[PDB]
Amino acid sequence: RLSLQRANVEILAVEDATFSVSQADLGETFRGIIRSQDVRSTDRDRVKVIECFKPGDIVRAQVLSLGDGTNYYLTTARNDLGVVFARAANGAGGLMYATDWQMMTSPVTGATEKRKCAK
Amino acid sequence: IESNKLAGVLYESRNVAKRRFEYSKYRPLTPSSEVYSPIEKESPWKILMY
Amino acid sequence: MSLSVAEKSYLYDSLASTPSIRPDGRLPHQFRPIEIFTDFLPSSNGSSRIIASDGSECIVSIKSKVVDHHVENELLQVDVDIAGQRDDALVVETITSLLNKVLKSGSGVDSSKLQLTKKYSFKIFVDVLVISSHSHPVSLISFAIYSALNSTYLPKLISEELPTFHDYDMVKLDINPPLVFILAVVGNNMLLDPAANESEVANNGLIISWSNGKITSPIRSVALNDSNVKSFKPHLLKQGLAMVEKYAPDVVRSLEN
Amino acid sequence: HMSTFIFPGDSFPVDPTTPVKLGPGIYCDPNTQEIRPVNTGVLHVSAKGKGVQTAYIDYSSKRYIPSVNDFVIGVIIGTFSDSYKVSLQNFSSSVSLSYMAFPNASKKNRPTLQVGDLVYARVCTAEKELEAEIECFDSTTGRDAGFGILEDGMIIDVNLNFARQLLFNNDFPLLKVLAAHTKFEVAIGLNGKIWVKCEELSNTLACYRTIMECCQKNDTAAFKDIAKRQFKEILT
Amino acid sequence: RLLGPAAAKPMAFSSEQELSLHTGFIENCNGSALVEARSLGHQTSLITAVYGPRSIRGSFTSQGTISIQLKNGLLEKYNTNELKEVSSFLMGIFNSVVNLSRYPKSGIDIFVYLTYDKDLTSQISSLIPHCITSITLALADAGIELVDMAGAGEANGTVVSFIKNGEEIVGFWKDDGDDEDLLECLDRCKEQYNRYRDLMISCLMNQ
Amino acid sequence: DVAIENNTLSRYADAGNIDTKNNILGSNVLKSGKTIVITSITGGIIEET
Amino acid sequence: SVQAEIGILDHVDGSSEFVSQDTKVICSVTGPIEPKARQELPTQLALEIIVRPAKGVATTREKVLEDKLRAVLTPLITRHCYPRQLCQITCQILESGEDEAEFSLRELSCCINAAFLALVDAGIALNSMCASIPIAIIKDTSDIIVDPTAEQLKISLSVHTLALEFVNGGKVVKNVLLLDSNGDFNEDQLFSLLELGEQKCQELVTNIRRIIQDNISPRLVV
Amino acid sequence: VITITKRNGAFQNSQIVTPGELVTDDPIWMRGHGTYFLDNMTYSSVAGTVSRVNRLLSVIPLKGRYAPETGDHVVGRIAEVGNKRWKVDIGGKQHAVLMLGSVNLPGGILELQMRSFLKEGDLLNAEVQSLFQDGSASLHTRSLKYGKLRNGMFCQVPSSLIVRAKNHTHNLPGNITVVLGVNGYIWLRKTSQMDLARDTPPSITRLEEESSWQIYSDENDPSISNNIRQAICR
Amino acid sequence: PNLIISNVGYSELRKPEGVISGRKTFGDN
Amino acid sequence: KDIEISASESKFILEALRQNYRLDGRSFDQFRDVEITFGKEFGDVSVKMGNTKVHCRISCQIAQPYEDRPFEGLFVISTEISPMAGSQFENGNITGEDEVLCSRIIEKSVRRSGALDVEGLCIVAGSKCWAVRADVHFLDCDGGFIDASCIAVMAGLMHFKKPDITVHGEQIIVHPVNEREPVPLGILHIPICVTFSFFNPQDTEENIKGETNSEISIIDATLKEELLRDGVLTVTLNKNREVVQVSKAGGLPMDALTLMKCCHEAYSIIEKITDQILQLLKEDSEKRNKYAAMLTSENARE
Amino acid sequence: MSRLEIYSPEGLRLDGRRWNELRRFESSINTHPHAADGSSYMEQGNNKIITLVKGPKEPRLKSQMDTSKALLNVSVNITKFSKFERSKSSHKNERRVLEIQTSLVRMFEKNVMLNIYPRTVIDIEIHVLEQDGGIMGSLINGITLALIDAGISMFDYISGISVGLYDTTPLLDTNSLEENAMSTVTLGVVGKSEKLSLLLVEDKIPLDRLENVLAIGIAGAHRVRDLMDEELRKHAQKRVS
Amino acid sequence: YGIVELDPECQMDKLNTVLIADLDTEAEETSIHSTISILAAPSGNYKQLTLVGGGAKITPEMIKRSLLLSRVRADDLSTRFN
């Protein structure tokens, strides 16, 4: 889910590299929330989450404080954190690759979409 | 009177007229809506640092 | 029930000590005052309403029907309905299946005491209605069906043809109704008839059935709470089991009165 | 200057060489990168050299989709802490009307709007992946005339085609045939809402009955006879 | 669900205990098992699956919550009232064996399918010691923590479940049977509990 | 690959020693890969007019 | 010759009524609207397909009818342009036109056509067009005939419900949407009816396009 | 031994006004609780007695619950933990709210882990600070005297049986301290260090108290006297 | 590859160019 | 998931009623013009009154009679509302208060009130009987749900024809539809439902103890008039001056004189709707039996 | 029983009463001070109804909660042993029962001042131990006396009376044998007025006779109000003193 | 069976599609939007066929291949144990 000031996600893996597949879709899976204040490293007060993430993108974010009443607190205020895998037009296009820090482009389709890349 | 809320407004009016002024040094320790002081914070300089 | 962990440790430490101090101060062999009303439903043969000290109230109605015992297996069907709980709820079907075993036609109650002709016999319908409950009511329903069965009157038989019954006279239901008791173990002490707060911090629970001055077959050892669930020494199993053998006659003397 | 009836999946009568500015009804495939219609309606094009060309499809619809720069009528259904919650159409999703989106807005004073109030605003955010947003003042130009609470009156539910042909097409003989019978003020919403208001309730009701009858009747030249009979019926 | 026409009637016709133990062979859940027992004129064949642990959204409990459910298979269909009665007795036992404090704000769902219960000549008393040994194998395969193995035995209706090499009793169940048969029924199941206890470990260590 | 077991859970499993109390007419325990399929068949009768 | 009317309901975004032989199906499309919790899709549009029989409640017979109709409309709608949205598509079968217990092919063929028509009137993004026809073979002549009557089904050996997808003025067939068959047939008869079914659906969309133009065009600039 | 009361035959064993009747026709009155104005005449909405205090006309119902008023010392357990506020069960018609700024936090100004030191079901005592429009009460724990209860047992009495006095809590013989709440929630605990040392016996701009989580810990007192626990049960 | 500008709404396609009054009060007559 | 009504729209319709105005232009006692569309097979009736459209389907089958009434047949009816008539109806909610109150009113009007001849539906006592089923399909909701549904079921039962059955002692042979002409069901009286919607320009207090009745009653409300409705009443009469059934629960507590007035106003309505169904059934019969004048066997002499 | 005389020329009914006489009315207040805040054991004739009122309290879930009024829930449970023949069906989820439960909620949500108790829910639990005709009216009188015991503000009394029409003779308070031989009408009169909050007619009645049936119906309902009112006077006076 | 459409971005005018037999695992059932399920009888007879072409285009090539690949599947199953 994409909100104006947050972005609801769904925890799929975790590392200590090696990972671990989550629960196989249906609910009762670990979910988190990336607050707008922890999206980027610079200008943490004014950001546009619509220009950072889109529904259906795999995002690598580090957890923060555990106020796990329902969700988790994540952050992407680094270089190696952000969108690591996405597709054009929310899955309706081609597989895009992270070029710049906030610019993702698909080679075949040639279209560009603004993300929060991680390279 | 048609809304039958007249007694509720007059009851709150009494609590406003029963308000009492008191200096900051001799104010009650328990925070109350009946007493008033220019300084009602235990450490007033803490809300300025934050 | 729902309590705080601060007071749960206080009741746990006070009930597991060697003095075995109870919350209300009653002795481990004592009970709470109970009010029982009988015979108030003219449309039914037997009836009873029981009221506990903590507020638990249960009503029991008894109906009868002539049925061929050669084709009718069970002659004592118990229908339990708890208010606020679904008919298919997990806590309702367990007592429904448990009471059908303590009052099984032939085991808990002999079928010879309700036979008519060599072909037909009376079928007893025990309808249970729990208005309110704060603990496990299997011991309270047993006290209600006891006074209801001992206050039941069925029509008299007149005598292979279809049986005929008298218009005015009705015979009394001479049936020994089994009794069910609840026991809670707290560490190393036995507690007969626990309370809502005693059973909430207890370690395990015991259900004993008493019939004909003896401990009969249908007994259980279900846990009273999912929080503190502990295994018990076999010496505790026989301690509380033999403990009811001493005070149950004092229960029947006060209940059959 | 070409206008022809097309269908979803039909070929697009536009050369790829010419620069194009597509709009509603036309979709760009994220894979094949071709341009195909997805709606059934009249295909409108306009080739002009000054040198941009545009193309869109005018289709019949009643479910409103939030689009930017649209004049919409909404009903306030919730009061949050930093914004309102408005309903542009039943069953549809909600839109956000912030307290700061008002003339002379300030943190100190909140707008005097309560639930159930009809508002007239401009769609400032219509993202597909986000909640739509409206505002009672054009944040791009500063305009604010007409925007605000529509006190009293009566609202009318019409299709989206009847709303655009009434706001943009100045040749639609509805406001002209209505003003010839009684003085009124109208509020045209692109979400299929037409708010009217007269001095007497008898005139407001007559405006409600004409717009309803003219919404289902496709004959435009029959609007004169509808109001002629409708305003005559209220006289009994 | 078709069930066919309602005008159709069902058909009406006028020492040593072998054991089989298995585990796994299920990909939906985390841990499963399969116990089979053939002795005298009665056979038992039931499958147990453990779907857990699953994190509960919005929960704040201090320890886990076990959910055991017995479902009628295809032969000797018991009544639904007695199925949940044994389940409540099974939950009363495993709430003291499974490490509940290790899995906060989460629950564990148990699914036991009494597929083939057959008699060749209360009938559920003989099946209880076989259901307990099937859940312990399935709970251990799912990586769930259990305080010591849990088993049970039968002694003419009386079913007693022991733990810690039979030192402490975790559950007690009795239906039908006789009177005053207590210490002998305990030792008949105490030696039977050890027969099922070491056999579960022998199957859980093979490859 | 598949592996099946017919007449395994039926009353007529042993053609010489029939079951005393059973209702299933036939069975088939099919397994393809890691999936398990159990198919029992019960019997009834209807009176037609 | 079949009959069809568009825009008959006042409280849905799009409505339709498809009449063929004796089968009559009224469909209603409403969307995009706010979905429920278990229905919303993060990227694309959600579909709530519901079909109902003429007599009795909705049994499991209509459940497979929903799942087959769902597979026809799902690739036909551009779902990705309505993220986190819902579209209710309800099909009400007024008259079956066959035997409900022994057959269920004519109702599937009319629900597909009625749903596509209601999807056009509601203004939903459609990648192409759709056409569905029932096909059966009489055991006498063993030849393929389209839209068989109720008496022709009881003598049929195998039934067919072919659903196609047309583009470029209702001429080029992009993909075969649905071809559900049940009975007795071989590979020689499969392409014997698939080639015949492609030219009977081509004149159907050509007849559908004429119908959906005689009603949408007057409502627009006219 | 058991004492069982038995019956047989039956199912069981000022100005009084009823809802719907006329109490007065004098408009010169102030309509109070249990009273609805209508057509310049006054009627009663509940069954009870008529009260005429000053010009305030009200009806006192027979069975009445607890009415939360400003400045009441009550006892209640936490029902749920919300967003920076905890709904506490006082026993009234609704759940009283407890904002995060109404309790003494040990960290202070320096953290949404509210359930760590105060979860659901935990019992405590506080004072009613104010009321809401719908009648809901707002509590606060800005005093050392108000804290999380422990070292005792909880009981409940009807709300209409608690008399309002000066000191809400009292010290009793046998090293026992009683906490009487006007809502009907009594807490019988052993005398602590606080209730024992207080209940029985120009350049200053005030300072802030430094209170740790010592009063929020669920850890009860280790050694409680066996002679004292039998007094609490008595 | 084509010369594509993002799909625009219905209002930006018109000719008045945002000088449209959505709420027109018809006084007198 | 529910209809949102603006405060401006709510105030306008109430004040319009205070000036004897309805948005659709009817009167306070004007029932919507009813239209009956008969389908192909017998028992296929489509009713259209105003913008509300409803469709009923009549069927029957052999079933076991009740143990307490072995000489009567069964009458089943279920009105499950689909999202077709509006997205406010959640599909699968068969326990809805509207669906519950609709079925119970028609069931009392047809079965309990003796509209359908249940005794004539008995083939063999306590074994075989007819179980007539009435499936009502709500197509487009605009108020008057139970008013149109009752018209659809009554027009459907009078248009439906049950299969012919010959009894040979204990056997029962159901004659195919092509073998023998089906026999129509027996109908004693024609219950027709008329609903009344109530409004108060005052409030609840001025209505409990208020002699001055300022209530506004309208006959057959629309959807917008129904959402702003305060009190609801449903009566059912027949052309025999008999009150079939009455259901009034909640809303504005009205007096006996106004409820009696509602019945006399509803009788003039049901009397006209009755003769229309009798006329439209007569016209539909001549549509199917065009040459029925030549096929008559019982003919008069001279 | 058998073939009885419903209304003989001597004006006597099958149970001895006359045309305008009521069955014995023995109501009881505060019968469950440990199970609900409101309690009423209604014993109208052979009928024996237990009515509980749990509230107003917080809802068990914050999902359904009206921030401007209260939620009124009615749970009518007809026991299996309500009649002579023990019921074999389920009764709880019966369609006839849901109609009664809804008709009771609408009847009282307009009479109970739900506005005085916002953001709350009022649960009404009913258990019928025995029935004998006119069960709907006795359900009405039980809820009225049970809410008053709970201290819920109401505008007036709601009285439940049942009237039957045998040929040309109305009969007050119909029992089971009378309902199985004539048409039945249950009324819901508000206080001493003629305002009807309930009007259920489930059998055919001539229009020329319904008005007189309603007049004699509301007249007997007022008599039912006084018997409930006099019960509250006696209960309040003995409780204070 | 299933008809899967490849892509050049995972190891280019047009492309080539492949046919997968007996779909399994969550990966195939979720992504493959074009399947063919058929009932094959001996002597070249078929009893039921479902042809859904949501994903890739179903060419007559893969129609004939799925039919012939099912006739051998029905012969092995009918002659597996009996």
Short mmCIF file of C-alpha atoms in Angstrom, two decimals, chain G residues 2 4 6 8 18 20 24-25 44 46 48 54 60 83 97 101 116 129 131 134 168 182 218:
data_model
loop_
_atom_site.label_atom_id
_atom_site.label_comp_id
_atom_site.label_asym_id
_atom_site.label_seq_id
_atom_site.Cartn_x
_atom_site.Cartn_y
_atom_site.Cartn_z
CA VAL G 2 -29.70 -12.58 -31.37
CA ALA G 4 -29.20 -7.34 -27.06
CA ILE G 6 -27.44 -1.89 -23.35
CA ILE G 8 -31.09 -0.95 -18.73
CA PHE G 18 -28.16 -10.80 -23.93
CA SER G 20 -30.20 -15.90 -27.72
CA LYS G 24 -31.81 -14.53 -21.40
CA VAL G 25 -29.06 -13.16 -19.14
CA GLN G 44 -4.12 -4.26 -10.73
CA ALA G 46 -9.88 -6.84 -8.63
CA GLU G 48 -15.94 -9.91 -8.10
CA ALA G 54 -33.02 -18.78 -12.70
CA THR G 60 -21.97 -25.39 -6.69
CA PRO G 83 -4.81 -0.22 -8.90
CA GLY G 97 -33.05 -22.16 -22.42
CA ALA G 101 -29.06 -30.47 -14.58
CA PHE G 116 -18.66 -7.99 -22.13
CA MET G 129 -13.50 -7.51 -27.83
CA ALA G 131 -17.63 -13.29 -28.57
CA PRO G 134 -22.32 -22.73 -28.02
CA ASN G 168 -8.69 -4.53 -35.68
CA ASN G 182 -17.52 -32.13 -22.64
CA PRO G 218 -26.71 8.82 -29.75
#
